[PDB]
């Protein structure tokens, strides 16, 4: 036995759970049960005749990369069923041989070096297939002759001999070259796989393009927020590869590997809510039925569990605590139900260890300036905000996926509460894609996939506790512009809209919300203290509305209140919507089954061709009908301004004042004066201190932002980049935002 052999066995256990798998474990047993079932099902449908022209009639098409890739995945599952302790097919020599015969047939008639490396779809030929093939080779290594292995490994080397791509693609390349290097025992290729992780979009922080950013963002495909899609893939692969190499001659030594720990704390943690990975960072993947938010979240936790196996202190311990929290938090879907057999073994060990306490839940406001995203995490809820700009695209739709993703990143608000299933259970193929919560659009009209012409997108963070975001709207597909802002407080999210103008000749609307209701669609709801009808198929306008309360799908923790300063007229409808995943993901393997879900949808009609139209509402998570009325009796927020020049909100109780300045002209909002485009938030503690945070959301000001605060200070301290020129009678300072990339600068002033 050599070191390569030890690595192959290490990878093998990562795929099978190892020889120590406990058949007595309820979840493990079920996993090995399905595995054998799915294996027998496929094995049962195989054409074993030597005169065969396909392995599975359903997947015939030696040239259709999609079908071929699916054939190898099936063979991988069958190989797993024949090598996982506890499986009723474990050690089945007849199965093992039928798998190897299929591989030889695929080699001769489909996957070999006679094909173009860049033939559609390149991803299948260079990555997808090789990843499945390497696993089969490791699992059935001992039953593979030198002649057979050559045809398998030579082919993979032809398609992917090296690593030179970015992010997930680069990591995928690394794992392909790496596992093969272990199989054929090539120290040079294995060294190269390890080095691949030090490249673009992986360990080193990116300041542009694909990769992880210092502020926690992750981008893939140049301009798309992807922490939860391609981001999940890069984490999974990076984690698996690092674990494999750890402690060996090729163990990762690059010092930047410590960045991986930060990805967990800053890139993934803030975007997870009780097991769900927010859809706003999953790109076109929201259109995949097998990857709804909780299933993706489980995958993220699986990687964290993987890292906990080799990461150094105190990260390994923190990782275990995070995983334990999320596993206990997710009462929607069992974590063990959709992760590898080995993950189950490793996870249970963490959950069953009493010395490991679940980590605390995140509580903060975070601005992901690099990917036009923002998030608020609090006890009982989380709010995700998705924007786009000249830097980040509206939405991605390629390979026939996410066809209706139009407004998923156009000032879209996502509220997470005790109704963990809100965005799962076929939300995406049924929700009205033209009415994404929080957005302003031309009724029933789509927009194009691409970056916008406006740079003002982003926001400010006040010591990571509170914050405000804004997006300068101006669609390219049709005429519509507006200033949209969001102010995040403790349990109030205020949305303001101004300067809403259009010459499109299409009715303009702003979606207050659009929530999936219970199976009967009879969720109780109230307006101004009066109960509203709960029947499905009913449309109704609510005029002079001061507030609305909508009971959630859970007895407690999922109610939502809506307050309208100055009153409003709401257009609403409660209906059952049918659809299929095939409609938003035209892939043949996509389930065509029809599904029906119920929704309560509310929006404000701005009319056709508005000019300077506006809106203002307050989202009130987890308040009962009585509490919403109470709030309306003495609202805690006050709109300071809502013009096209400045939008500001004040929260008296907390002493908070947020203000988004849209032009490069001197303007004032309450105590705040700014000479340029900026996002600002101050917190005042009567006669004690005045805190202030400022950012240049445009990421294009190469000079400064001149701020003045209407208070007299005694002293101060400030982040470098801020220069104070006056404390009394008023506060004056400039913020050097040159190359700041949307970050927030903080200062604290001592008051007299």
């Amino acid at each position: 036995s050599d070191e390569f052999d030890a690595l192959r066995i290490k990878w093998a256990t990562l795929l099978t759970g190892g020889p120590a798998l406990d058949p007595a474990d309820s979840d493990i047993a079920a996993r090995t049960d399905k595995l054998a079932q799915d294996a027998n099902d496929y094995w049962e449908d195989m054409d074993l005749s030597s005169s065969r022209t396909y392995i599975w009639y359903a997947l015939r098409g030696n040239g259709t990369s999609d079908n071929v890739n699916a054939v190898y995945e099936r063979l991988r599952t069958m190989a797993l069923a024949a090598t996982t302790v506890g499986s009723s097919l474990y050690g089945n020599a007849d199965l093992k041989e039928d798998i190897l015969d299929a591989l030889d047939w695929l080699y001769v008639n489909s996957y070999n070096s006679t094909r173009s490396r860049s033939a559609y779809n390149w991803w299948h030929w260079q990555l997808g297939i090789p990843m499945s093939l390497n696993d089969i080779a490791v699992l059935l290594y001992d039953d593979i002759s030198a002649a057979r292995m050559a045809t398998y490994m030579d082919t993979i080397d032809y398609f992917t001999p090296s690593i030179g791509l970015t992010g997930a693609n680069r990591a995928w390349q690394a794992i392909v070259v790496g596992v093969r290097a272990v199989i054929v025992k090539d120290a040079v290729k294995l060294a190269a796989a390890r080095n691949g992780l030090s490249g673009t979009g992986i360990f080193p922080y990116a300041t542009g393009g694909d990769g992880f950013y210092a502020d926690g963002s992750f981008v893939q495909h140049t301009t798309f927020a992807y922490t939860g899609g391609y981001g999940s893939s890069v984490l999974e692969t990076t984690a698996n590869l690092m674990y494999l190499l750890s402690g060996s001659t090729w163990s990762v030594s690059d010092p930047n590997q410590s960045n991986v720990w930060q990805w967990i704390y800053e890139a993934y943690r803030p975007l997870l809510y009780k097991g769900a990975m927010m859809d706003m960072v999953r790109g076109r993947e929201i259109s995949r039925s097998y990857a709804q938010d909780h299933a993706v979240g489980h995958g993220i936790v699986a990687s964290i569990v993987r890292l906990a196996q080799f990461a150094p202190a105190p990260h390994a311990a923190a990782f275990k605590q995070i995983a334990k929290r999320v596993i206990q938090e997710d009462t929607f879907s069992s974590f063990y139900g959709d992760v590898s057999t080995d993950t189950i073994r490793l996870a249970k060990a963490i959950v069953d260890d009493p010395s490991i306490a679940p980590a605390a839940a995140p509580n903060l406001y975070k601005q992901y300036a690099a990917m036009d995203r923002a998030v608020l995490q609090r006890p009982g809820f989380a709010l995700g905000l998705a924007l786009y700009s000249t830097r980040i695209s509206s939405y991605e739709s390629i390979n026939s996926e996410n066809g209706r993703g139009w407004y998923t990143g156009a000032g879209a608000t996502y509220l997470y509460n005790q109704d963990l299933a809100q965005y799962s259970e076929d939300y995406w193929p049924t929700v009205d894609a033209y009415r994404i919560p929080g957005t302003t659009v031309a009724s029933g009209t789509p927009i194009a996939s691409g970056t916008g012409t406006s740079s003002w997108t982003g926001g400010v963070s006040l010591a990571g506790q509170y914050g405000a975001s804004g997006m300068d709207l101006s669609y390219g597909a049709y005429n519509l512009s507006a200033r949209k802002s969001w102010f995040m407080f403790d349990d109030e999210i205020v949305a303001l809209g101004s300067g809403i103008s259009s010459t499109a000749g299409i009715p303009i609307e702003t979606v207050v919300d659009n929530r999936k209701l219970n199976g009967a669609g009879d969720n109780a709801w109230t307006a101004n203290g009066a109960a509203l009808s709960t029947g499905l198929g009913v449309a109704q306008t609510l005029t002079g509305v001061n507030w609305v309360h909508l009971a959630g799908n859970t007895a407690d923790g999922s109610d939502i209140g809506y307050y309208f300063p100055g009153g409003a007229t709401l257009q609403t409808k409660r209906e059952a919507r049918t659809g299929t995943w095939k409609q938003i993901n035209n892939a043949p393997a996509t389930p065509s089954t029809a599904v029906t879900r119920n929704y309560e949808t509310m929006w404000i009609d701005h009319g056709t061709n508005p000019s300077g139209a506006s809106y203002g509402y307050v989202l009130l998570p987890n308040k009962t009908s009585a509490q919403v009325g109470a709030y309306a009796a003495d609202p805690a927020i006050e709109i300071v301004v809502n013009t096209s020049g400045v939008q500001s909100v004040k929260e008296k109780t907390l002493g908070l004042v947020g203000a988004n300045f849209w032009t490069d002209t001197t303007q004032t909002a309450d105590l705040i004066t700014s000479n340029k485009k900026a996002s600002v938030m101050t917190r005042e503690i009567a006669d004690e201190r005045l805190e202030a945070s400022v950012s240049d959301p445009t990421q294009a000001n190469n000079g400064t932002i001149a701020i003045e605060l209407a208070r007299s200070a005694e002293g101060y301290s400030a982040d470098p980049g801020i220069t104070v020129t006056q404390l009394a009678p008023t506060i004056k300072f400039t913020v050097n935002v040159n190359g700041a990339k949307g970050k927030s600068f903080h200062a604290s002033f001592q008051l007299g």
Side-chain angles (χ1 to χ4, degrees), residues 1-640 642-752:
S1 297
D2 53 54
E3 180 161 38
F4 291 107
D5 289 334
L7 291 174
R8 186 183 69 256
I9 296 174
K10 190 175 194 183
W11 186 253
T13 284
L14 179 148
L15 297 171
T16 68
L21 263 193
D22 189 1
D25 182 296
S26 176
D27 302 278
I28 292 172
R31 211 64 180 63
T32 60
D33 266 26
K34 177 187 177 181
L35 188 64
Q37 179 199 299
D38 290 16
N40 277 302
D41 278 47
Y42 298 135
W43 191 20
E44 180 184 302
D45 295 354
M46 286 183 81
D47 185 314
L48 296 307
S49 67
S50 56
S51 181
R52 61 188 178 188
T53 64
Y54 56 67
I55 305 301
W56 284 290
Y57 177 78
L59 300 172
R60 63 187 187 299
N62 303 36
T64 310
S65 72
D66 290 58
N67 283 183
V68 183
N69 184 261
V71 170
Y72 281 88
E73 288 188 304
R74 285 189 170 186
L75 294 173
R76 177 172 176 281
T77 295
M78 293 169 74
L80 284 171
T83 54
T84 300
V85 184
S87 179
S88 59
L89 290 170
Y90 180 74
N92 192 307
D94 299 297
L95 178 59
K96 290 184 174 181
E97 185 51 46
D98 280 0
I99 292 171
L100 296 184
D101 278 321
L103 289 178
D104 303 328
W105 183 94
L106 288 164
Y107 164 59
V108 169
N109 305 87
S110 179
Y111 192 58
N112 59 230
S113 57
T114 71
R115 305 181 75 84
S116 166
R117 296 183 57 258
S118 59
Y120 181 82
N121 175 169
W122 76 271
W123 191 87
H124 284 143
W125 305 118
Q126 308 177 206
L127 302 178
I129 293 174
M131 290 190 287
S132 287
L133 183 52
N134 274 325
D135 290 340
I136 296 174
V138 171
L139 296 171
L140 311 177
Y141 185 82
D142 300 315
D143 313 88
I144 298 175
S145 60
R148 272 175 163 162
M149 193 61 86
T151 65
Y152 303 161
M153 296 302 113
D154 285 332
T155 303
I156 290 181
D157 192 70
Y158 164 68
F159 284 103
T160 298
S162 64
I163 304 157
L165 300 177
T166 74
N169 290 314
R170 189 184 186 81
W172 278 317
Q173 279 186 143
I175 197 64
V176 165
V177 167
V179 178
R180 165 180 179 290
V182 173
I183 297 177
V184 297
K185 305 191 178 186
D186 185 319
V188 176
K189 290 281 185 170
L190 189 52
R194 173 243 290 140
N195 294 160
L197 293 184
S198 299
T200 310
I202 306 184
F203 291 160
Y205 280 119
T207 58
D210 310 326
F212 284 95
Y213 290 69
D215 74 0
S217 312
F218 177 78
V219 169
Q220 191 75 63
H221 282 188
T222 318
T223 60
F224 300 93
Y226 256 121
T227 309
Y230 282 111
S232 295
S233 296
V234 68
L235 169 59
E236 174 187 46
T237 311
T238 297
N240 284 349
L241 181 53
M242 288 181 77
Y243 164 75
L244 173 64
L245 304 176
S246 187
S248 77
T249 301
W250 304 277
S251 180
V252 177
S253 57
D254 185 335
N256 287 332
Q257 80 185 74
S258 61
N259 285 171
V260 175
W261 315 153
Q262 292 317 95
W263 298 350
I264 301 305
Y265 308 137
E266 307 289 356
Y268 300 88
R269 201 173 83 75
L271 296 173
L272 285 176
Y273 189 80
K274 290 196 179 190
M277 183 59 179
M278 294 181 201
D279 296 322
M280 64 173 192
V281 291
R282 306 201 296 105
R284 72 179 193 276
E285 293 185 38
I286 60 176
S287 70
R288 301 177 175 180
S289 64
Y290 56 89
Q292 290 179 73
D293 64 4
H294 281 271
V296 175
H298 292 347
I300 298 301
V301 173
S303 297
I304 294 173
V305 162
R306 178 53 56 186
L307 293 177
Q309 303 314 302
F310 73 94
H315 303 290
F319 291 167
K320 292 182 174 179
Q321 285 187 280
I322 293 182
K324 188 166 184 170
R325 173 179 193 65
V326 185
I327 293 173
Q328 308 185 325
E329 280 181 329
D330 197 341
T331 51
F332 163 70
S333 178
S334 188
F335 163 83
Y336 313 115
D338 45 13
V339 290
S340 67
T341 310
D342 199 47
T343 305
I344 302 176
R345 180 176 67 73
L346 300 173
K348 294 297 271 289
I350 298 174
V351 175
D352 294 340
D353 191 342
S355 63
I356 299 177
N363 187 139
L364 46 42
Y365 170 82
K366 201 187 200 308
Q367 196 87 218
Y368 287 104
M371 61 179 186
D372 290 351
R373 294 294 181 286
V375 67
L376 177 70
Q377 287 264 16
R378 287 286 193 273
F381 84 87
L383 184 292
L385 174 63
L387 321 173
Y388 84 111
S389 57
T390 50
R391 310 172 299 271
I392 298 297
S393 296
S394 57
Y395 75 106
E396 168 177 85
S397 179
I398 57 182
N399 304 322
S400 298
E401 296 187 289
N402 203 204
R404 303 208 288 268
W406 307 302
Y407 300 111
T408 54
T413 61
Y414 300 80
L415 183 64
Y416 296 85
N417 53 208
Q418 197 48 40
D419 175 7
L420 311 194
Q422 178 64 21
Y423 298 112
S424 277
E425 285 180 351
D426 324 275
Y427 172 94
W428 290 112
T430 55
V431 69
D432 176 0
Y434 288 114
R435 292 186 171 122
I436 301 305
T439 69
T440 298
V441 308
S443 193
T445 314
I447 56 170
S449 165
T451 47
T453 62
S454 302
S455 69
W456 204 135
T457 292
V460 63
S461 171
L462 186 68
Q465 309 166 55
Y466 309 99
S469 294
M471 179 183 86
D472 204 6
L473 174 59
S474 194
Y475 295 129
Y478 55 80
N479 189 78
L480 172 59
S481 65
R483 312 292 205 197
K484 294 175 69 66
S485 291
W486 295 266
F487 300 88
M488 288 63 148
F489 299 133
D490 271 327
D491 66 346
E492 301 160 293
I493 301 88
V494 185
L496 290 186
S498 69
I500 301 176
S501 304
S502 180
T503 60
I506 302 174
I508 302 300
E509 47 182 60
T510 289
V511 189
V512 177
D513 209 349
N514 192 1
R515 307 285 292 181
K516 171 146 60 60
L517 305 173
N518 62 37
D522 68 4
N523 291 242
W525 67 316
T526 309
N528 291 184
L532 299 170
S533 59
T534 59
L536 286 168
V538 180
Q540 68 186 99
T541 304
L542 307 181
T543 71
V545 185
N546 292 136
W547 61 269
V548 172
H549 169 79
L550 173 63
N553 299 331
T554 64
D556 297 280
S558 65
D559 288 9
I560 303 172
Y562 312 79
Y563 178 67
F564 304 86
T569 291
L570 285 59
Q571 309 301 150
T572 80
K573 70 178 181 179
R574 176 167 298 202
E575 61 177 5
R577 298 180 65 79
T578 297
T580 70
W581 286 90
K582 183 88 67 183
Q583 293 177 168
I584 58 178
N585 203 109
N586 193 284
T590 296
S592 53
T593 307
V595 295
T596 307
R597 299 299 173 191
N598 305 310
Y599 292 91
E600 174 56 65
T601 309
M602 309 178 292
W603 67 96
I604 301 172
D605 181 8
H606 294 116
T608 297
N609 287 177
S611 173
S614 61
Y615 68 73
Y617 60 96
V618 187
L619 297 184
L620 302 167
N622 315 314
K623 263 185 175 59
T624 65
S625 183
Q627 285 166 167
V628 180
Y631 181 89
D634 181 28
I637 61 92
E638 169 181 352
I639 302 178
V640 171
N642 191 28
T643 65
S644 61
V646 59
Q647 293 179 114
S648 176
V649 174
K650 179 193 299 188
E651 215 291 1
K652 186 195 306 170
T653 297
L654 305 173
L656 293 168
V657 174
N660 284 158
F661 300 84
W662 299 104
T663 65
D664 287 320
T665 68
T666 302
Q667 292 175 291
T668 299
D670 195 78
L671 76 179
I672 310 167
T673 294
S674 175
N675 69 156
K676 284 164 182 162
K677 297 174 179 177
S679 183
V680 187
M681 181 160 287
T682 54
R683 193 184 184 184
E684 169 176 32
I685 304 301
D687 292 351
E688 293 237 290
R689 52 180 179 286
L690 179 61
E691 301 186 23
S693 293
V694 182
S695 77
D696 164 30
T698 71
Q699 306 195 196
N701 185 330
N702 47 292
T704 64
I705 292 175
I707 298 290
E708 174 164 353
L709 302 173
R711 292 294 186 287
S712 190
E714 289 291 73
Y716 76 101
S717 64
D719 286 346
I722 288 178
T723 302
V724 174
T725 52
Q726 191 187 85
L727 293 175
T730 61
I731 294 167
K732 294 185 177 184
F733 63 94
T734 53
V735 189
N736 196 317
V737 299
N738 177 59
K741 297 308 174 68
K743 72 163 64 179
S744 296
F745 295 75
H746 183 78
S748 182
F749 302 85
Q750 155 182 45
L751 305 178

